[PDB]
């Protein structure tokens, strides 16, 4: 869902990228490094 112009609970109510984002997306696992502190949003007006 973390790409320009996408939809889902994260990409709509929580953090959204423009269809004309100029840039790149990078991710790595942290299971062995970082639990409940990781909050995310289910709903929005």
């Amino acid at each position: 869902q973390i790409a320009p112009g996408q939809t889902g609970k994260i990409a709509d109510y929580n953090y959204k990228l423009p269809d004309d984002f100029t840039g790149c997306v990078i991710a790595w696992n942290s299971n062995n490094l970082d639990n409940y502190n990781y909050l995310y949003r289910l709903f929005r007006k």
Partner: protein, 50 residues
């Protein structure tokens, strides 16, 4: 009179042609698809009309 009126008929008839978009209706493309994919369908109707 016939040539101007046939040209103005062909010009309006060409709104309702698909040009390889998923509909001829701009409101189908707007309501059915989301902005990331809808724009790539709208550019076909723009380039066709143009």
């Amino acid at each position: 009179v016939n040539q101007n009126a046939q040209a103005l008929n062909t010009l309006v008839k060409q709104l309702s042609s698909n040009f390889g978009a998923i509909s001829s209706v701009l409101n189908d493309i707007l309501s059915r698809l989301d902005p990331p994919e809808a724009e790539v369908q709208i550019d076909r109707l723009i380039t066709g009309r143009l």
